[PDB]
């Protein structure tokens, strides 16, 4: 007779949390930013075209220099391109062809890879032999690896389908921190600008904000009706956007612990695969299954621009640190760079 | 023209990388990719052993053809998030144990293993990512079914069964019930083969099915329809 007591106590605590959230919502975001001038029409053109892939490209990440780019597809080879000259700087053969995530180290020395092999591979780029060697192989997960993000040259954050997140030490190869509490498979990660907190959305239509140095679940956000496939932190670290399969994106705040903005449209019935912000945080780029990407106004929830030119589902988006251009990778084995 | 010596050398390196990537792609595009599936204790391990962490790869060489089978065993997660990565395989091998016709799915929940296998089959068959991928069904463990038919009737899981306790018509009815789950019978073919614990003609049947699928694809893409 204790299980039902615990369940009713939990539901009472959830009702109290809901009441506390409702008692703090004075006005919506659409009422405070009503006097903000609209952005207008976003007209971006494809400047470069990176060819060479022969399979569906699943991941892509920009570096800290805003010049080099990394790309991963089902061919089983990482390709490091020079975005200014469209030249393939590096080609790294992989032991696993099913790659669904990749990461670029902030120093530019290491590259992460992962997929259905449940092992996170870290390869070193600057080697005295002039080639690429298998620097580290992190094992311990039983589900597919969905995202990879580097904190520094010694620590890495990974997410797997085991409803848990992990923080690994590169020098020791042991799981330093384990984040538990989710009920669905975590699909994406997002690091804070100060590398102190991180948000992770799962297939249970819910995201959780965790602390790195404590390993505890700080906050939890809900509101979606389908599985969340992408997530991205705000440039200032006080908000985050989530995209789900319900063709509706959401933008939550950290200090408010409530739903701040929602982006929906009747002519969109396709799920979201990638979500990213600009340098200023005014525009929100989201890739959908309608063979194109949509750039919405984060302050007015209006469609600011449409980026088309892909003949398949957009699988990954990327925005440089300085905000000079936006890279887009889809399953058509082609990478595009809009400016 | 307007590039320096280092820039020209970098362009040459990029061209060499492009050549290597194209060579690797042309070499890999000639191999056959098969997707292996099956429920628990359905004899998938026996099949992968006779024909020979996360996803397992298996390489076979038969009649100058290089088959690459993907075993997704021990991957207990939501398939709806990683099945689309297998869009484009040559065929889907699906292992089903007949002896599971009168056994529970590891729990006394009144759910027979045969019903769960039929549910998995009709879920992976009507999937949006495999609207034209052929399915090769392997019914394993018939050497035990031959004795289990004489100890337990088939009416335990199929109340509408109106036959006798013989292997031939029971296997035929099971094959018909498995094939009736395919809705799009025009753009999908289902190959059935009765396997046992000591069968050696599995690789030959797989090779024949792969050749048939290749012939059908060559008939389709060349415009002969």
């Amino acid at each position, epitope marked *: 007779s204790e299980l039902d007591q615990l369940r009713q106590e939990a539901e009472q605590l959830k009702n109290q949390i809901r009441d506390a959230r409702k008692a703090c919502a004075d006005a919506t975001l659409s009422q405070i930013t009503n006097n903000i001038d609209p952005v207008g029409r976003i007209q971006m053109r494809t400047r470069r075209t990176l060819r060479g892939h022969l399979a569906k490209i699943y991941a892509m990440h920009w570096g800290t220099d805003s*010049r*080099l780019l990394v790309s991963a597809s089902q061919d089983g080879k990482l390709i490091i391109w*020079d975005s200014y000259t469209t030249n393939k*700087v*590096h080609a790294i053969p992989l032991r696993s062809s099913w790659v669904m995530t990749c990461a670029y180290a902030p120093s*530019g020395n290491y590259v992460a890879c992962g997929g259905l092999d449940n092992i996170c591979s870290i390869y070193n780029l*600057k080697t*005295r*032999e*002039g*080639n690429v060697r298998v620097s580290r192989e992190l094992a311990g997960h039983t589900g597919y690896l969905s995202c990879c993000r580097f904190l520094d040259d010694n620590q890495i954050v990974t997410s797997s389908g085991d409803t848990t997140c992990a923080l690994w030490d590169i020098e020791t190869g042991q799981q330093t921190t384990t984040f538990t509490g989710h009920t669905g498979d975590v699909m994406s990660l997002s690091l804070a600008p100060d590398t102190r907190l991180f948000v992770s959305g799962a297939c249970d239509a819910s995201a959780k904000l965790w602390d790195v140095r404590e390993g505890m679940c700080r906050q939890t956000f809900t509101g979606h009706e389908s599985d969340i496939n992408a997530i991205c932190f705000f440039p200032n670290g006080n908000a985050f956007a989530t995209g789900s399969d319900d063709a509706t994106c959401r933008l939550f705040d950290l200090r408010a612990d409530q739903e701040l903005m929602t982006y929906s449209h009747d002519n969109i019935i396709c799920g979201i695969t990638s979500v990213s912000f600009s340098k200023s945080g005014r525009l929100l780029l989201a890739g959908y299954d309608d063979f194109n990407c949509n750039v919405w106004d984060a302050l007015k929830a209006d469609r600011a621009g449409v980026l088309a030119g892909h003949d398949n589902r957009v699988s990954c988006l990327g925005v440089t640190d300085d905000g000079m251009a936006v890279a887009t990778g889809s399953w058509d084995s082609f990478l595009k760079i809009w400016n | 023209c*307007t590039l*320096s*010596a*280092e*820039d*020209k*050398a*970098a362009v*040459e*390196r990029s061209k*060499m990388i492009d050549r290597n990537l194209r060579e690797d792609g042309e070499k890999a595009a000639r191999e056959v990719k098969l997707l292996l599936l099956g429920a628990g204790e359905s004899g998938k391990n026996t099949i992968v052993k006779q024909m020979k962490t996360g996803i397992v790869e298996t390489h076979f060489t038969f009649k100058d053809l290089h088959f690459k089978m993907f075993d997704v065993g021990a991957q207990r997660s939501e398939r709806k998030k990683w099945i689309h990565c297998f869009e484009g395989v040559t065929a889907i091998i699906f292992c089903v144990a007949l002896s599971d016709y009168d056994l529970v799915l590891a729990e006394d929940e009144e759910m027979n293993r045969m019903h769960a296998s039929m549910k998995l089959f009709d879920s992976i068959c009507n999937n949006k990512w495999f609207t034209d991928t052929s399915i090769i069904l392997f019914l394993n463990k018939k050497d035990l079914f031959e004795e289990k038919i004489k100890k337990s009737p088939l009416t335990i899981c199929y109340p509408e069964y109106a036959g006798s306790n013989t292997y031939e018509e029971a296997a035929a009815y099971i094959q018909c019930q498995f094939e009736d789950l395919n809705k799009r019978k025009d753009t999908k073919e289902i190959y059935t083969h009765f396997t046992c614990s000591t069968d050696t003609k599995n690789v030959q049947f797989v090779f024949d099915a792969v050749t048939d699928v290749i012939i059908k694809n060559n008939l389709k893409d060349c415009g002969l329809f």
Partner: single-chain antibody
Framework: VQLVESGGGLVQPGGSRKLSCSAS????????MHWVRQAPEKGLEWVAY????????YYADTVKGRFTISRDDPKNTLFLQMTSLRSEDTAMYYC??????????????WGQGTTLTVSASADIVMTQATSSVPVTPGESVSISCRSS???????????LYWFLQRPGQSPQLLIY???NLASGVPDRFSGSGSGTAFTLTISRLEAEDVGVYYC?????????FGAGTKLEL
């Protein structure tokens, strides 16, 4: 990473000689190879260069037509055939490894070099004044360098290389790109400048940093080395 050369010795004038260089410790197929010559007058001079996969090969205007460089990839070897040897061929030959990509460090490893004795023009000109700089350890050193052509390319890069050669050893790369420290070199050395005027600054000088400092331009072939600035203890 190791390069070992062989095939030197004494040769009569007008004959021929086949020099060999073998590599060990790296992927030889992905690196370009340079053959450089050093006469007894302490002046460095580039002779030949071959890229990865033997695609593009460059020779010097003083040795074109007589020398032939070849690259055997399955054995990771570099051969150099030399016919019609003249009295000005008595020198030491070095093999240099050099890869070219964004962020790379070319000329990062120099071979041991073999000796060869023989008994008896829009090329950029690099000059180094003050051939002798006497200074005790502890004080800073400033080495100036000029050029006859602007090395600042349109891409914003400056193809200027600073090497150091110790007495009785092989030259070592100190600076590959302008204001960019190489690998294995301490942070005591620095380089700066612009246009056709550059400077190398050494702070907290030790006794182990004695040698000759050479400058090289890589804007266009052929590559020209400086006269050499000797650092006197």
């Amino acid at each position: 990473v190791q390069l070992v050369e062989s095939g030197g010795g004494l040769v009569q004038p007008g004959g021929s000689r086949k020099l060999s260089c073998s590599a060990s410790g790296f992927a030889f197929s992905s690196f370009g190879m340079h053959w450089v010559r050093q006469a007894p007058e302490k002046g460095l001079e580039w002779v030949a260069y071959i890229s990865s996969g033997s695609g593009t090969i460059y020779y010097a205007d003083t040795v074109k037509g007589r020398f032939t460089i070849s690259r055997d990839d399955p054995k990771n070897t570099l051969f150099l055939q030399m016919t019609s040897l003249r009295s000005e061929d008595t020198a030491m030959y070095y093999c240099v490894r050099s890869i070219y990509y964004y962020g790379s460090s070319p000329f990062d490893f120099w071979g041991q070099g073999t000796t060869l004795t023989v008994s008896a023009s829009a090329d950029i000109v690099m000059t180094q004044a003050t051939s002798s700089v006497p200074v005790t350890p502890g004080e800073s050193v400033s080495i100036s360098c000029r050029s006859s052509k602007s090395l600042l390319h349109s891409n914003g890069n400056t193809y200027l290389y600073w090497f150091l050669q110790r007495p009785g050893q092989s030259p070592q790369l100190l600076i590959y790109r302008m204001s960019n420290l190489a690998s294995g070199v301490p942070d005591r050395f620095s380089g700066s400048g612009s246009g056709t005027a550059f400077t190398l600054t050494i702070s907290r000088l030790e006794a182990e940093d004695v040698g000759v400092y050479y400058c090289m331009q890589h804007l266009e072939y052929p590559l020209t080395f400086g006269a050499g600035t000797k650092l006197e203890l």
